[PDB]
Structures are given as C-alpha cells and as structure tokens.
C-alpha cells in the first residue's frame, strides 16, 4: 500500500496522472517477459499490472487469452511467476506492482498463504478478477494482514451501494472500468485513487481520463498486441513497446 500512496502523492505534486501497463508474466517466455517489463519501466510506466497465467480465465479478452496461451507454451507456472516477481522488485524498489489474479490460484494453497507470498516477493496489490465485493471478505482481510492493497473493480453498472463498498474496502487504487459521476462519488466516499481501464490504447484517452478526474489509466490489450505482432523480432518488440509507453506516459503529464 505504501508504494501506491507514495506514487500518487508524488504524481499529484506534479499534477500528473499515472500510466500503468498490463502484461502477462512469462509471455512470451520468462527471459523475454523480464526484458519487456524492464522496457515498460524504462519507458515511463508509473506502476505495473501483471497477470499470472491461469487455465480458465473467463474475464480475459482475446488478446490477453492469447498471452496466457503463449506463457503456457513456454511452461510458465505460478511458482515461476513469483520468482520473476521477486527479481523485478529486486531491480526496482519503488514502482508499485499489482497482480491480476483468478480466485483459484489465490485459494489453491490457502488464501492467507497467497498474500503472505505476495508480501515476501514485494507485490503491492492484488485484484482477483472473479471475486465480486460480495465474496471478497477472506481475500481483503488476508490482503490487509500482509500489507497488500485489495483492488476492486468499479463497473459501469455500479450503484450507490457498490460505490460505498468499493470506497470502504479497497486500497491502493480503484479499478474504474470504462465517467465523471462515478469518479466524483468515489472521491466523495474517499475511495482509493481511480485508474481507468478497458480499451485505453491512445494518448488522447490517457489525457481524457486525467481531465475527467481519474488519477491515471491502465492499458493492457494495446501493450499485449505489440508483443503478439513482434514475436519473430524481439528487438523490434522492445523498441515498439518503448515508443508506445513513452507516448502514453507523456499524455499524463501536466
């Protein structure tokens, strides 16, 4: 939680929004995924959102579904992902790292033990994609015991009760699914800072999100497509990723 508080305080001192890419750990192989992640950071990512490949990821869109399949073809497992996460934190001490998880990989060997391993490797937040606020009690409790922010999605079909729960229970950032009314109510309820996500693939959508009052934006399919289109030229993949991330990040600056 501390890393997100530190980053949003610093960005607000600079009147800047955050730019947060999403990638699947291990896509398209462990080594290339570590180089992709260091490029995203070197190009200006403020924080990272990282998926652990799961066999039945019913909320992933097709671009992401194909990222999971490449990672599984390279033999990536959750254990390997945690090893990658430890090395990423060992290289970058302050960037907030959040995971995007499916409930079975968290529940599998004990919900408390999953959040203990996240704390041990240096993860700062976890979003469990198939746990709604109604079922989140054991996940959010374990997260807070291990100083991990529990992230909640605030959908476009949210009602007032949902807004209040998301404000009260979430920490780190509020995942705002692509918004002025939702944004204003979240701030009224003192929710964690909002990051707009879904469909963010150009500079003008980053600036629009910050102008709407969000603290930043998340982009995943646009980033994953660059991987998918350059599998045969890893050098070109990294150069294209650097170009895309520095343009998106420049859109967030005052």
């Amino acid at each position: 939680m501390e890393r997100y508080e530190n980053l949003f305080a610093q960005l607000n001192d600079r009147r800047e929004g955050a730019f947060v890419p999403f990638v699947t750990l291990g896509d398209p192989g462990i080594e290339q995924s570590l180089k992709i992640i260091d490029t995203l950071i070197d190009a200006g990512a403020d924080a990272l959102e990282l998926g652990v490949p799961f066999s039945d990821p019913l909320a992933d869109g097709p671009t992401i579904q194909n990222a999971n399949l490449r990672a599984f073809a390279a033999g990536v497992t959750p254990a390997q992902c945690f090893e990658m996460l430890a090395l990423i934190r060992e290289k970058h001490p302050t960037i907030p790292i959040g995971l995007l998880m499916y409930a079975n990989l968290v529940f599998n060997n004990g919900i408390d033990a999953f959040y203990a391993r996240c704390e041990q490797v240096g993860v700062d937040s976890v979003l469990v994609a198939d746990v709604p606020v109604e079922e989140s009690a054991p996940f959010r409790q374990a997260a807070l015991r291990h100083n991990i922010a529990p992230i909640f999605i605030c959908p476009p079909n949210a009602d007032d009760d949902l807004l209040r729960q998301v404000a009260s229970y979430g920490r780190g950032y509020t995942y705002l699914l692509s918004l002025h009314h939702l944004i204003e109510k979240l701030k009224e309820y003192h929710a964690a800072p909002a990051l707009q996500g879904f469909g963010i693939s150009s500079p003008e959508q980053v600036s629009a999100a910050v102008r709407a009052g969000a603290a930043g934006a998340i982009s995943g399919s646009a980033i994953v497509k660059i991987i998918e289109k350059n599998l045969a030229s890893p050098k070109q993949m990294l150069a294209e990723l650097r170009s895309f991330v520095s343009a998106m990040k420049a859109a967030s600056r005052a």
Binding site: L58, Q65, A103, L105, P132, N157
Partner: protein, 394 residues
C-alpha cells in the same frame, strides 16, 4: 445481498466479475417472483405436459433383476422430448427470460446436447438463440450443430484461446456482460454461480416428485435408494430433491470413473478432486497441484466435466447422499444389458447409474431392495461410439 442463500454449507457462492452481479441478482429476483406466480407455474406445467410429454413413465424392469431380490424401476427421462432430462429446465429458464422482458438466449456447448436443448426451447418460445461453441467442438459434433441450426439457433464457432469449451464459455459470458438487459444466459447444469444451482434444481425437481407418486402408487412405499449419474448434477438433483427429507431413502450419485480412478483419466471430482473456485462457484474440482483446472475424461461426453454442482458437494459432506464412480467398461456393460433384456437403449451417461444399480444387485443378490435409476436420456446418439469400441475389441 441476495434473497436466497447462495451457499450449500461451504459450497456455491457467486464468484463472478463484479459486472455480472446485477444480472445474477436480476435473475434471482425474477425466479423468486416466478415461483410464487400461479400463472408462471401453469404456463411451465402446460409446456411440460403438452409439449415435452410429462409425466414420464416409471418402468419396472423384471427381466434384468430375475433371480435376485432387487426390484428395479427406471424413471423414463429418455422418453422426454429431445431424448434427455435437459429439456425440462431449459423450458423453465426460457420462461424466466421472457418474464424479465428478454427476447434473446445465450448458451455455450461442448458436446452439443445443452446446445440442442437451448435451441429447441428458444424455437418454441420465440427467442433468438446464439450458442457459442469451440471450433474444435464444432468440427466433431456435426449432427448436433446441424440440429441446432435447423431449429434456428446461431452457432458461433469460437477460435479464440484454445478453441474449446472454456473459450466458448468466456465469450458467452463476455457477451452476457454487455447484453444482459436483453439476453439471458441459459446455464445447462446445476452448477455455476447462484442462483443457477437453485434454479436448475427447482426446474428439474418434477423428476423426483413424479417418481415419488409413481412408486407409492405401484409399490405402496418409497424406494430403498434412488440412483443417478452426475456430470454437473442436474438430473441427479432433480431426482433427489423431493426425497431429501425422506431419510429412509438412499440418494446415490454416480460420477464417471473413465479408464479407472487410479489412471487420472476420469470425471469424478466430488470424490477424487479437491475444493477450488471456478465457473462462478466454490466446489470440488479436478486440479493440478498448483491450481490449474485439469482435463476430465469419460467415454460419455455428457459426463466429461471437471467439477460438480455445490448442492451435491454439500449433501455428500453431511452424509445425506453417497457418491460412487463407474468406469467406461462398467457403463458399456450396463448399456448392452439394458438393450438386450429390456429393449431400451440408454444414454451412456445414464448407463453409469444403471451400472451401479446392477452392481448393488449382483454383489448381494439375496438382499431385498427397491431401487429407482434415473434413466436421464436415450442412447441412439451413442450407437456409433459403442459400435466402434466393440468392433475394435473384436
């Protein structure tokens, strides 16, 4: 907040992305409203009787039990329109979709049986039905694909991900997350998130209600046990529900043991898997040691599912129902036995239930027992499968 409890003991719940919660709550409220509406009840009863052919017979099979003290009846869901029990609850869910003001049905299917069921109810009730299907399943289930399209459903071949059933599901739920105001997701078994396990049980519970009245008429007492196969759990919960409070009546659920539990190639998570969270629910499932969902196997495609409905897991936990497994070869023997001795060709799914009643009889042939097997479907669809196996063994 829900109207009904979403859990059966530890099992069940609503493990979906937040954006699908309003669709689930809407459905639960529509269902609770429907269950108190005499007109909804009359409309459902009318389609069940005059369209689908309920009540179904309860057939005593004397030839098969000859020389033993077992009396065996078969609940004839194989005579229901479409040839399987699946028809009962898709009519009920189509009526719920119409009650919510929806004119579209969304479904996904692997084997193609739930797809056909959803397409026939949608044709009857004036609903536009789109059925997502992994391109690999499309390729292998030509007959069922053609039945669905004859009945006007749009069969959408899914190439994304691994182009299998889990990918048809993801696409179907993604669609449903954007279109739930006008479309209803017709889930085909007694599993998935609440309120589906509850709705599917209540819209299949006429199987056990009829069985109770029919056995009391013919024998003057309740069964010693009622026995049914268990994929996701809808035909078995349909047979067991009305007997739950009749504590003298055994409830026996039969999962597929495939090539043998010890091989790992089976579909028996309730007894041989481990609790996990997937498909919107907390339930027993077949999983790897690091939590990936494993592949299931059965000679019968209808039972080839790696999890089980949460009410079954609950009934097992408390000892009210007992769960066993039957292998491919035991199911094939029961299939041949029924054809030869009663002139009834049973679905291979149902043949697992029948195989277990035959073992109860043959193991202890002088125990006096009155057993009912749910013959969930007919097996004309399985004749090539059976033929090619037996031809292969010579």
């Amino acid at each position: 907040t829900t109207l009904l409890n979403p859990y059966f003991g530890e099992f069940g719940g609503m493990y979906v992305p937040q954006i699908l919660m309003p669709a689930l709550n809407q459905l639960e409220e529509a269902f609770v409203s429907a269950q108190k509406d005499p007109e909804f009840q009359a409309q459902f009863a009318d389609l069940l009787k005059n369209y689908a052919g309920r009540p179904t017979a309860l057939t005593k099979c004397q030839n098969i039990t000859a020389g033993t003290r077992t009396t065996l009846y078969l609940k004839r869901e194989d005579l229901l329109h479409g040839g399987a029990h699946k028809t009962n609850q898709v009519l009920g869910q189509a009526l719920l979709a119409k009650r919510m003001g929806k004119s579209e049905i969304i479904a996904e299917t692997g084997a193609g049986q739930h797809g056909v069921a959803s397409a026939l109810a949608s044709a009857l009730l004036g609903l536009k039905c789109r059925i997502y299907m992994g391109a690999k399943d499309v390729e292998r289930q030509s007959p069922n694909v053609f039945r669905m399209r004859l009945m006007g459903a749009e069969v959408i071949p899914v190439h994304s991900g691994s182009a299998t059933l889990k990918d048809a599901c993801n696409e179907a739920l993604a669609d449903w997350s954007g279109s739930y105001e006008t479309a209803h997701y017709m889930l085909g078994t007694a599993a998935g998130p609440h309120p589906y396990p509850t709705i599917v049980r209540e819209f299949q519970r006429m199987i056990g209600e009829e069985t109770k009245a029919q056995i009391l008429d013919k024998e003057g007492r309740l069964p010693d046990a009622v026995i049914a196969c268990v994929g996701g759990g809808s035909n078995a919960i349909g047979m067991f529900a009305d007997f739950i409070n009749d504590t003298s009546v055994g409830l026996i659920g039969v999962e597929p043991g495939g090539h043998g539990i010890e091989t790992g190639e089976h579909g028996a998570p309730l007894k041989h898997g481990r609790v996990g969270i997937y498909f919107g629910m907390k339930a027993p499932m077949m999983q790897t040691a690091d939590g990936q969902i494993e592949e299931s196997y059965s000679i019968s495609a209808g039972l080839d599912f790696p999890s089980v409905g949460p009410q079954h897991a609950y009934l097992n936990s408390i000892g009210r129902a007992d769960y066993v497994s039957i292998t491919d070869d035991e199911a094939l023997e029961a299939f041949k036995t029924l054809c030869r001795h009663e002139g009834i060709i049973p679905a291979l799914e149902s043949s697992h239930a029948l195989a277990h009643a035959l073992k109860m009889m043959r193991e202890q042939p002088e125990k006096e027992q009155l057993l009912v097997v749910n013959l969930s479907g007919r097996g004309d669809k399985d004749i090539f499968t059976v033929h090619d196996i037996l031809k292969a063994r010579g």
